[PDB]
């Protein structure tokens, strides 16, 4: 999983991107561990 609402549930190697608009958060990982 590469996007979520709990930042932590993302277990991303680098800091996930916060994509917030008005009311709307979501966090997305841009760093990939193969």
């Amino acid at each position: 999983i590469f996007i979520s609402d709990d930042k932590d549930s993302l277990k991303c190697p680098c800091d996930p991107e916060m994509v917030s608009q008005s009311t709307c958060r979501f966090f997305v990982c841009k760093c990939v561990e193969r």
Partner: antibody
Amino acid sequence: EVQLVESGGGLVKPGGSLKLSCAASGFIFSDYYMYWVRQTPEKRLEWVATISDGNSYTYYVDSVKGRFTISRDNAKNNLYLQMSSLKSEDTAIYYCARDGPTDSSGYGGFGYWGQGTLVTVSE
Amino acid sequence: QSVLSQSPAILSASPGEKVTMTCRARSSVSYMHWYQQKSGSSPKPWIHATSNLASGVPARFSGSGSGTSYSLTISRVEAEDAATYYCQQWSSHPPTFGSGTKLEIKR
């Protein structure tokens, strides 16, 4: 303004150990990952390790694993690199650092760097 | 893993010229980072995400690429630009830095 103030670098005999520590202020320490990154004296730039936030998952560079331990004390806005078993190629400038500001972050980039702390490993 | 090499090593320009420095990767990567550094102090973020200007940074600077080809370019080099520059990706773990190009200025 953000600030990241590294310290306790210095000299150490091959095999020895050292605990670098970096003092963060100017933000909410616990909303960010921290990273240690270093620069060999040939100016080669190596990422060394990453400690998350909230739950605190730690990730290492190979050439280093289970000798160094990254860590955070969120209660003191503080970041640590515990280093054991030092080899001379660990000689370098150690930089603690973190992702950028809002609009310019979340990409795997290092948006603010400490000022460096010099680690020498020698006889 | 995703080892970067940067060309050239030493680029020389007189104040006024455009210069371009390029950063190849072993495979695909969707974002490049550039930091400017000068002796005595630690890398400053220069260009974020392939092509955003880290705040502070002169609009004579620019970045692009994609896939395995990236670069940073100065429209019209100045003197206060003599420095080493470094590329950095984190598309794929671990993250890596290029060995970095050094601009020197003609006079």
